[PDB]
RNA sequence: CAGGUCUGUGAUGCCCUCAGACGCCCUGGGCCGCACGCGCGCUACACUGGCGGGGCCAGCCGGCGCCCGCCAGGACGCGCGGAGCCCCCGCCGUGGCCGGGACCGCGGGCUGGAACGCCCCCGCGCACCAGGAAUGUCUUGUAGGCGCCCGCCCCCACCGCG
């Protein structure tokens, strides 16, 4: 059975490590190539001054989105071992699909 | 102000086509100055001259249409 | 005084940490005073550049 | 005149419903689609008792609705909207029919600069 | 290839034309007293406009290919700015009723086909674009 | 070209030069709430075209013109929609304005005191009143 | 230039504008974008067209807008074509070229007259007889194609009519006087 | 329309040999050439025909640039997607360029024709990159600020 | 720098109120009231245009279908899917006019508990024919023209950020 995998990673050096550590353990399991969402950028612009007084200069935040394809060919078992197998690093999103 | 013609030209549409004919070229807007007639009603006496053939339009464009007799060279 | 208090029914959105009721800024689901979401945005992640 | 082609005699005696296709674009949506609420309905009911109460009453229905529109039946009675600060009569008159109490309440003073 | 070699708007005029004189359409009587869009606030002077626009659902259905895509988004392809407002001018949409009723009339003349969604160019149609534009080519 | 000049219709002066739509643009101004070529100019116009034209507008729901199309649409009087133009809009406005004055109404006061009704801002563009 | 009108012995006859002016290096259609802004002396070799061509672009209105620009020089180039019975393009390297004025009095409180460099000219030519049309199609029935071509054939004459000569002419009169 | 699998996706088999670029202001453009007579389509559009009525001498630049014998036996075929009408017009003809010099690149003749367009007009063979800028908070663009009440 | 923010907050001193509260809720009004002066804008003054019948290309990035309705919208299901300017061809013809759309009068919708909100259709046709002293921002994909998206939003942008 075929289960579908997505990572999401705010950092892009953290999801990086991930993605190289996913094809280290999955290799036998057949991984899909690690095709890259395109960055979803959450954008937030806000007056930098607490009051409206002097220029109205603006404060720009933003958060980056990353996001990775994958697919494995494996048992039910078998994802679970690739799961608990993967780098664990903190902050991460973990999917297991169908 | 300008004369508005009321498409009048009858004994005198000959005559006004007998100086357009005469002119080297002709556009649709140097009619209406030159006699006070609308340039809508210049296209419409132009298109009876094209008909004939006396004049030749060079180019047409949806406000531009630019004639020069083809004729006039006898 | 059941029927008093709390009668009438409208959106009181505000911010999780503030509770003022004025620049809720939900753009992306966040209920965040601006003035408040300037005081803590880095935690959320969001970078200036 | 008759209103909106029913006699003012007719009027009277007619029901919203009756001229209900009649009215107004919105009367139509808040009476016919939307239905109107219990605080409307009990003053229509408070003003149907009142007029037919008939004990010689000045009540001069003193009233803070002004999202009521005028029903047929209340031609002929001096309802009283508050604009803010004070009660302002308004009788009812043919035309005012399918109206709202806030558009013959005076919310605000002129300016006289 | 075809009708793409000739030029859309060339091919949208003729098949109109012909369509009307082939009895494809027959144009409804809202049509007469009506301004295409909200956009538009004056009708078409052309008197010959729900041919004009009956060629372009038609033909642009043929550009479809395979979308069986719908009315609204005909609609969008004629739409234009309503002016007349102190405020900016911004782009409204073609009238759907207009567009509904001559890719209903083309279906129920068979000249189009309801696959899902919305409609591609019927087969029997196919040829029907693809014939005029052979006629436009010589 | 045959050509006639000015023509009359409802007590207003229409130039034979301009076309048809434009001739018919406004009549006594408030007018202009068909069987006859709109391009063909208002001297070229023919008086029965005009006499079919008189028909259409004094009952315009008897020759496919709509409802929606027409100047009024509930009155307060039938109840029905119909088309007035000339004397009878300037009637019609003051029987409207005369019933926004009949009853106390902030659309009454205003229409008296010249302030605008509905509009917003008289703070600052309602300057030269 | 629109498949017509080629340069063959089109050229300049003055020698200092000749100097600042293309003849040669244009184009197909007056378009391209050469960036000609860049460096300092770009304007130079930018086909004169353009040049013409992108001044009637402006005055807001008809800004950026130089397909329909490109199509009015178009129609007017062969009403020049027609009235004269002469390429367009060498009556139009005339008419810029007597139109630029060779002498201005700029300040250097009192005012100098000092002599005009030939790009100045080049531009100010180009820039005057667009005026010179943009402003005799205004509210008037002739079309800015019809000025822009009157003015052209008069500018290549001297002829005072041609608004470019009488501003040339005003330019180097309190240029005199103030000298 | 922005740079996707797009540039294969529009012709399953009909393999082309030679595959050529041309992208400017946004307007990118995929050119694929199959060698056969010679004719030249964009966007299912024969080039002859080009929207731009005046914009179709801009378009056929490189074909004027080289006799009829080098777009004898080239059959091109183009895909532009995104951008505008001007930017796609300026797209089409870098992409023409780009496939006749992919035809004779591995020869020292692709210098021939390198010199020939290029000297002819600029840009013919090249693409100048010219992307747009990003407005500021103050004004309404780049280089543009809103008028400064007082002062 | 006593520039601005104690009215963003479980940041806060001093202070004021504290049970007919300067606490909180509930209802109705006000911030949008207008002789007038000004600041940021938006739309103009037409034909390098309005009209409007087609072609047709966007980017921050993105949903549609089927009928009913002039529209506005709505019913009903499903996952989908893209500007203006400009381009050609008509048309009007230098006329406050076929420019301009401010106000007004009937209606038809929508959102909400409610317009007093918005949208649309038929009207209606104000100044305005290029703006005095002054002034304001800009040098490449730039000025300008031209559309679109989001924020705050029940509705609504001549706004802001893009």
Not at chain 3, 18 to 43: H, P, W
Not at chain 4, 18 to 38: E, F, T, V, Y
Not at chain 4, 65 to 90: A, C, H, K, W
Not at chain 5, 103 to 111: A, D, E, P, T
């Amino acid at each position: 059975q075929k289960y579908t995998i997505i990572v999401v990673g705010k950092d892009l050096k953290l999801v990086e490590r991930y993605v190289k550590s996913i094809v280290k353990e999955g290799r036998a399991f057949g991984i899909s190539g690690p095709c890259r969402a395109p960055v979803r950028r959450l954008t937030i612009t806000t007056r930098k001054s607490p009051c409206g007084e002097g220029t109205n200069t603006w404060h720009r935040f933003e958060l980056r989105m990353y996001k990775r394809t994958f697919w494995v060919t494996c048992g039910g078992n078998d994802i679970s071992t690739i799961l608990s197998k993967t780098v664990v690093i903190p902050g991460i999103q973990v999917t297991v699909e169908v | 102000v300008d004369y508005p013609t009321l498409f009048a030209d009858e004994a005198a549409m000959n005559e006004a086509l007998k100086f357009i004919k005469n002119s080297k070229c002709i556009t649709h807007t140097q009619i209406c100055e030159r006699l006070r007639v609308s340039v809508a009603l210049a296209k419409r006496v132009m298109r009876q001259l094209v008909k004939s053939g006396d004049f030749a339009i060079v180019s047409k464009s949806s406000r531009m249409t630019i004639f020069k007799n083809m004729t006039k060279k006898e | 005084r059941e029927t008093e208090f709390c009668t009438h029914i409208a959106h009181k959105r505000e911010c999780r940490i503030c509770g003022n009721y004025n620049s809720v800024y939900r753009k992306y689901g966040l209920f965040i005073c601006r003035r408040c979401f300037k005081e803590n945005a880095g935690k959320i992640g969001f970078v200036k550049l | 005149p008759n209103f909106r082609g029913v006699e003012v005699e007719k009027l009277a005696t007619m029901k919203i419903t009756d001229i209900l296709p009649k009215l107004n674009a919105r009367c139509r949506r808040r009476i016919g689609k939307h239905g109107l609420s219990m605080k409307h309905l009990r003053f229509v009911n408070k003003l149907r008792l009142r007029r037919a109460a008939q004990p010689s009453k000045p009540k001069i229905v003193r009233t803070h609705l002004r999202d009521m529109i005028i029903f047929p039946e209340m031609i002929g009675m001096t309802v009283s909207v508050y604009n803010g600060r004070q009660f302002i009569p308004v009788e009812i008159k043919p035309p005012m029919v399918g109206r709202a109490l806030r558009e013959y309440s005076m919310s605000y003073k002129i300016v006289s600069h | 290839s075809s009708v793409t070699r000739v030029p859309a708007d060339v091919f949208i005029n003729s098949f109109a034309a012909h369509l009307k004189n082939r009895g494809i359409i027959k144009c409804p009587a809202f049509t007469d007293y009506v301004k295409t869009g909200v956009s538009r606030q004056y009708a078409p002077r052309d008197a010959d406009w729900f041919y004009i626009k009956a060629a372009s659902v038609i033909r642009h259905f043929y550009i479809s290919g395979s979308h069986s895509i719908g009315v609204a988004g005909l609609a969008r392809k004629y739409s234009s700015l309503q002016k007349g407002k102190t405020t900016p001018h911004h782009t409204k949409r073609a009238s759907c009723k207009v567009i509904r009723s001559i890719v209903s009339q083309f279906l129920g003349q068979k000249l189009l086909i309801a696959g899902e969604r919305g409609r591609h160019i019927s087969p029997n149609g196919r040829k029907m674009v693809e014939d005029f534009a052979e006629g436009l080519q010589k | 070209n045959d050509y006639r000049d000015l023509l009359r219709m409802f007590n207003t002066n229409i130039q034979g030069k301009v076309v048809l739509e434009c001739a018919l643009v406004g009549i006594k101004g408030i007018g202009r709430r068909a069987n006859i070529d709109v391009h063909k100019r208002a001297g070229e116009l023919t008086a029965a075209e005009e006499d079919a034209l008189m028909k259409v507008l004094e009952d315009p729901l008897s020759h496919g013109i709509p409802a929606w199309m027409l100047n009024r649409n509930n009155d307060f009087e039938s109840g029905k929609d119909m088309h007035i133009l000339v004397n009878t809009i300037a009637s019609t406005h003051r029987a409207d304005l005369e019933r926004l004055r009949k009853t106390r109404c902030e659309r009454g006061v205003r229409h008296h005191h010249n302030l605008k009704v509905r509009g917003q801002h008289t703070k600052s563009t309602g300057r030269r009143g | 230039l629109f498949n017509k009108w080629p340069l063959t012995d089109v050229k300049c006859q003055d020698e200092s504008l000749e100097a600042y002016i293309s003849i040669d290096n244009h184009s197909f259609v007056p378009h391209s974008a050469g960036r000609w802004s860049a460096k300092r002396f770009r304007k130079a070799k930018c086909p004169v067209v353009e040049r013409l061509t992108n001044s009637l672009m402006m005055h807001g209105r008809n800004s950026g807008k130089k397909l329909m620009a490109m199509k009015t020089v178009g129609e007017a180039f062969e009403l020049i074509n027609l009235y004269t019975g002469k390429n367009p393009v060498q009556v139009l390297v005339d008419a810029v070229a007597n139109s630029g004025p060779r002498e201005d009095s700029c300040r250097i409180v009192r005012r100098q007259s000092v002599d005009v460099s030939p790009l100045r000219r080049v531009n100010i030519g180009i820039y005057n007889i667009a005026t010179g049309a943009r402003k005799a199609a205004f509210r008037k029935v002739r079309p800015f194609a019809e000025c822009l071509a009157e003015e052209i054939m008069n500018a290549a004459a001297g002829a005072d009519k041609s608004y470019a000569i009488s501003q040339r002419n005003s330019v180097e009169r309190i240029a005199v006087s103030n000298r | 329309d922005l740079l996707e699998r797009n540039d294969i996706e529009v012709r399953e088999r009909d393999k082309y040999t030679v595959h050529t670029l041309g992208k400017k202001k946004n307007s990118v453009a995929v050119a694929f050439v199959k060698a056969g007579k010679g004719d030249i389509l964009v966007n299912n559009v024969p080039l002859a025909l080009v929207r731009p009525e005046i914009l179709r001498t801009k378009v056929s630049e490189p074909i004027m640039i080289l006799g009829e014998s080098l777009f004898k036996g080239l059959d091109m075929n183009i895909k532009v997607a995104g951008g505008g009408h001007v930017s796609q017009i300026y797209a089409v003809r870098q992409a023409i360029s780009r496939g006749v010099l992919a035809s004779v690149k591995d020869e020292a003749a692709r210098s021939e024709l390198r010199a020939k367009l290029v000297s002819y007009d600029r840009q013919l063979v090249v693409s100048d990159p010219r992307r747009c800028e990003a407005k500021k908070f103050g004004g309404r663009g780049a280089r543009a600020r809103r008028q400064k009440s007082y002062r």
